[PDB]
Design a protein around this ligand. Structure first.
Ligand SMILES: [K+]
Ligand SMILES: [K+]
Ligand SMILES: [K+]
Ligand SMILES: [K+]
Ligand SMILES: [K+]
Ligand SMILES: [Mg+2]
Ligand SMILES: [Mg+2]
Ligand SMILES: [Mg+2]
Ligand SMILES: [Mg+2]
Ligand SMILES: [Mg+2]
Ligand SMILES: [Mg+2]
Ligand SMILES: [Mg+2]
Ligand SMILES: [Mg+2]
Ligand SMILES: [Mg+2]
Ligand SMILES: [Mg+2]
Ligand SMILES: [Mg+2]
Ligand SMILES: [Mg+2]
Ligand SMILES: [Mg+2]
Ligand SMILES: [Mg+2]
Ligand SMILES: [Mg+2]
Ligand SMILES: [Mg+2]
Ligand SMILES: [Mg+2]
Ligand SMILES: [Mg+2]
Ligand SMILES: [Mg+2]
Ligand SMILES: [Mg+2]
Ligand SMILES: [Mg+2]
Ligand SMILES: [Mg+2]
Ligand SMILES: [Mg+2]
Ligand SMILES: [Mg+2]
Ligand SMILES: [Mg+2]
Ligand SMILES: [Mg+2]
Ligand SMILES: [Mg+2]
Ligand SMILES: [Mg+2]
Ligand SMILES: [Mg+2]
Ligand SMILES: [Mg+2]
Ligand SMILES: [Mg+2]
Ligand SMILES: [Mg+2]
Ligand SMILES: [Mg+2]
Ligand SMILES: [Mg+2]
Ligand SMILES: [Mg+2]
Ligand SMILES: [Mg+2]
Ligand SMILES: [Mg+2]
Ligand SMILES: [Mg+2]
Ligand SMILES: [Mg+2]
Ligand SMILES: [Mg+2]
Ligand SMILES: [Mg+2]
Lengths: 168, 98, 34
RNA sequence: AGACAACACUGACUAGGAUAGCUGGUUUUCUGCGAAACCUAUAAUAGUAGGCAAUUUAAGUAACAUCUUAGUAGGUACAGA
RNA sequence: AUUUUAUCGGUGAGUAUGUAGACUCGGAAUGACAAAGAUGAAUCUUGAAUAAUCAGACAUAGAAUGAUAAGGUUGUAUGUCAAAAGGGAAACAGCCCAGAACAAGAGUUAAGGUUCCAAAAUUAUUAUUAAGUGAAAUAAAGAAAGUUUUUAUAUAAGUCGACAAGAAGAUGGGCUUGGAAGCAGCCAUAAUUUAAAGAUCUCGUAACAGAGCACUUGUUAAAUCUUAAAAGCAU
RNA sequence: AACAAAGCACUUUGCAAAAAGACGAUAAGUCUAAGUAUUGAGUGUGAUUUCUGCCCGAUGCCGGCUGGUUAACGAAUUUUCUAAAUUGAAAAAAAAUUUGGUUUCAGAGGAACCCCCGGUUAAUGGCGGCCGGUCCUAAGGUAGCGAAAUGCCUUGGCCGUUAAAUGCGGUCUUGCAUGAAUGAUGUAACGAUACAACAGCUGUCUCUAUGAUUGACUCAGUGAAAUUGGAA
RNA sequence: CAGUCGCGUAAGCGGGGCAUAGGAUCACAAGAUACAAAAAGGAAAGAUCUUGGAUUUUUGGAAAAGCUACGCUAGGGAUAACAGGCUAAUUUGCGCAAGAGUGUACAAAAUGAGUGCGCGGUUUGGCACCUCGGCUUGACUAAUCCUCAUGGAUGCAGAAACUAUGUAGGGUACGACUGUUCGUCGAUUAAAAAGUUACAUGAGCUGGGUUAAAUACGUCGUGAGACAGUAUGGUUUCUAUCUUCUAGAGGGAAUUAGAAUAUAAUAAGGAUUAACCUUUGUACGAAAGGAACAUGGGGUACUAUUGU
């Protein structure tokens, strides 16, 4: 399939669910792994649609057209969102398929980029993509430390320090 | 909703002072129990577990004394006075990172 | 149910442990349904 | 025209003979204890029955509640791929 | 017939990255069961006698559903109300305290408060804010010579600002075009000489010319006085 | 605009003891009627002009076989229990047969309705698709009418009427969902029916004003009512 | 445990199937038991055990179709339609951010794809706390149609218009069509803008729409009847107790013994429009066209002013 159209059945209805909320110190998906720069969702955990991620991709291509770059996607739309009619009454079963979506935890990377381009030219492409995506986004470089929840592990900070009851 | 539960998002300096003293009072109950048993050379699993994964008021940060974790909030924090029976239940530790 | 009602309510089978460790039993007593 | 048949007519008036799982009402004081809005069944779903169970006060208690110590069942949060 | 791929699909490998109601190799707390001991307000069981109740509501946490709307609908855990007065939340069924047998007391306290309405501090310490922001129901993204702090950094080897002058030559680079001379577009953009000067960043010409910039020197001049970022509180 | 109506049409009624129809806890009997097929009753339509098409398959009704079916009746069958007798058994013994009583089974033949055949549309009712061709039906809406009292789309198109027309009139129609005695269609005459237009007329309006009487208001006489938890 | 069968050297296993998805009584029918036998001997009809036939599928187990707008009674607001409340998906309601692109050139004069962050409570909806239009007369909001001040405008010469910032004092009319709010159109105008208020206002009016009984048409239904259909017609009650309000009074308390007359500060309301000429054919402009500022347009009286 694709990162926007999975090889799943639209008839099997999926429960709403919730995005992951790491409460045990997990940094899963909070670092740049493939590209040199990344786009991080820094505010809150959300469920992004496939039409919003497609527009974000078009915005990065429209701004970087005519140049050499490699765009990576770290999210996959594998969550079916079934919307019942707004004009319908409550009950009478679950709604029909509307669109695909993906659940993203806080401080996770959405897009990564690698190419022979200038940093400022990539900051603008991610700035525009962030403007059109739901929530607040941030520019990240490869090598930056991971994030535990909403706290960055900077200046020798470790996960065991965040778990230690004594922190004063 | 139309039913008003007027609960301010933050606490007053008077509610905070009492919170510090309630956390301080609980520490004295545990220390009094731990010291009384140590004189006899005894131990209780509940006490050994409290002194291992719970700090003292003097070791807590203000954010941990007046707020709690709430996954539904913007910044994953919430007024501790919004917890049920918050003046008679223990609450000192939140998930790491928040 | 759904657009077409389908009453689906089974009788509980109540499987699992009926006696825990170091619990006294006599002949015939069920200890575990599985 | 379901029109008229003497206040009444999709069937008058009068005397005799009803029911109502529904609504309303049910009158002095003091004292002791003190619920439920759940399950199952029902021609049921405004009802009812049996349980859980409120009460009375006798007969029992190796009763019941809680903690401690040791032991057991089971896979949630989390974490992981 | 023929070979070749930093193109598509497929297979193999990866102790690679992510994803989770019907994945759980790892794995809590809680809750559940039973044993002994201890404690306690008889709260338990049985016998006999014998009811009411069977739209519940809200809060908190976590879900399904809805539209991650509803004082919505529906489970689970806990409590209150229901059937609970009293103090706090301006007023208040459900929230925070606390369970009213009747009086007395500058009595002792809970939550909550202490300038006045109104019982009690105009009580002490260190900072921030100048907006009545706020002060018992947080409007957002965002903008910005508001202010404070911290962390880097520049400065008599003159920071910062202003002012004065300079800012070359091969060369009008080649192509394209009616024209393309740094400045429509395409390709190249090792050099050379200078205190420095992009085969060119912004205006300008039909095309030249011309005015600025990057950059260079000088003058004025700061002895806690440059610039930037982050954070806090404000606009 | 509904009912009735004159007119029109269909069915029914032979009167010999009761014409049919209606009435009669149910009859005698009465009306019909001292009537007789040009009589009476029932049903639909609704004067008259011009007209009233196709389908008898379904439903209803009528008629019809030396037919089928066919309850009662009934040729032919059958059983339970018990009494007595016979046979049998004659061992601790049933069992079988006949008869009496008692109690069951049983159906060759044998009515109407029904099955079957035919008739009937001013009987209840029905009256097509697909692309000149083709499939289907008992038959496929004929004549006429047609944005209608019928029309969702829709304020259909065009013409006339208005300074301006979702109206009204005329006209064309592929009419969601017109239609021929549940009648079709067009005039005269009639209408406190409904709609539209013109002229005149007007306080309907522009835009109200003044005047009159009776109430309203005050004094005297008489003297209600719905309503009302309590009220600063 | 008893009874008696199978397999196995034996120990032993066997009361169907690896486990989890097939309803009674009653009546009826077939076998056994030896219980009772309505005077007695029998029997009939009963009792006990085994067994069989069930969309008893509303499956703890009735043999069961509709209309009512002619409707009735008991109840519920424990479940609807109007309004209010909560919500804000949606909207014919708006704002901000970013800027693909259009604008001969040039992002931001104008214009603004698909989007993101919000406000608001007008439309259509959700929930279930709770069972129309017109006329008359207002009040309020400001997201502004006109009038007043004003920034921007290679795209502001002038004029007119565009966009935007202030600003709600006043105004926003007349007619035809439609029951209409809405909408369409005619003709004027400086302009002929919106919204909230129980989509303000029926104990103030109207009753055309919706609209019970009557009736017809079409469609649907075997039919009685029905329809978000169409058509004609169809009883609109109330003497104001209280609050508020509009007017007018009786009494009173005033620096104070009480009066007559004339009255201030102060308070509450009221009045609230726009256009033309003159200037001037001046600025501007190739021309056409055409401002701003300022003065006057009260007088066939006074006065002022312009002509003769
Ligand atoms: K026929
Ligand atoms: K026939
Ligand atoms: K025939
Ligand atoms: K026969
Ligand atoms: K025809
Ligand atoms: Mg965003
Ligand atoms: Mg409220
Ligand atoms: Mg089923
Ligand atoms: Mg009738
Ligand atoms: Mg009548
Ligand atoms: Mg008690
Ligand atoms: Mg309860
Ligand atoms: Mg039943
Ligand atoms: Mg009932
Ligand atoms: Mg495991
Ligand atoms: Mg609720
Ligand atoms: Mg109650
Ligand atoms: Mg209370
Ligand atoms: Mg207060
Ligand atoms: Mg005191
Ligand atoms: Mg005081
Ligand atoms: Mg304030
Ligand atoms: Mg060139
Ligand atoms: Mg040029
Ligand atoms: Mg005729
Ligand atoms: Mg006769
Ligand atoms: Mg007729
Ligand atoms: Mg006729
Ligand atoms: Mg017979
Ligand atoms: Mg025969
Ligand atoms: Mg005919
Ligand atoms: Mg006919
Ligand atoms: Mg009088
Ligand atoms: Mg006998
Ligand atoms: Mg049942
Ligand atoms: Mg059951
Ligand atoms: Mg009717
Ligand atoms: Mg309700
Ligand atoms: Mg200007
Ligand atoms: Mg004024
Ligand atoms: Mg209204
Ligand atoms: Mg009213
Ligand atoms: Mg009339
Ligand atoms: Mg009065
Ligand atoms: Mg005055
Ligand atoms: Mg004169």
């Amino acid at each position: 399939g694709s990162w926007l159209e999975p090889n799943l059945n639209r008839k099997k209805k999926m429960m709403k669910g919730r995005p992951r909320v790491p409460t045990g110190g997990s940094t899963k998906g909070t670092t740049v792994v493939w590209g040199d720069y990344g786009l991080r969702m820094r505010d809150h955990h959300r469920r992004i649609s496939a039409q919003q991620l497609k527009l974000a991709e078009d915005t990065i291509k429209q701004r970087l057209r005519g140049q050499k770059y490699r765009l990576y996607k770290r999210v996959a739309c594998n969550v079916g969102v079934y919307v019942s009619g707004n004009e319908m009454r409550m009950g009478k079963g679950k709604g029909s398929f509307d669109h695909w979506a993906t659940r993203v935890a806080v401080n996770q990377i959405i897009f990564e980029i690698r190419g022979q381009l200038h940093e400022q030219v990539i900051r603008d492409a991610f700035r525009l993509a962030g403007h059109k995506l739901p929530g607040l986004y941030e520019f990240v470089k490869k090598g930056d430390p991971p994030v535990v929840g909403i706290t960055k592990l900077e200046d020798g900070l470790t996960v065991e320090d965040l778990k230690n009851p004594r922190k004063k | 909703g139309g039913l008003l539960w007027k609960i301010p998002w933050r606490m007053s300096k008077f509610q905070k002072l009492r919170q510090r003293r309630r956390l301080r009072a609980v520490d004295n109950v545990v220390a009094t129990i731990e010291n009384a048993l140590a004189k006899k050379g005894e131990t209780v699993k509940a006490v050994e577990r409290w002194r291992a994964e719970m700090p003292t008021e003097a070791e807590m940060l203000p954010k941990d004394k007046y707020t709690i974790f709430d996954r539904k909030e913007k910044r994953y924090r919430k007024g501790i006075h919004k917890l049920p029976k918050w003046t008679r239940v223990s609450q000192r530790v939140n998930p790491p990172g928040y | 149910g759904a657009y077409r009602l389908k009453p689906k309510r089974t009788i509980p089978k109540k499987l699992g442990a009926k006696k825990t460790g170091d619990q006294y039993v006599i002949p015939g007593n069920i200890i575990y349904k599985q």
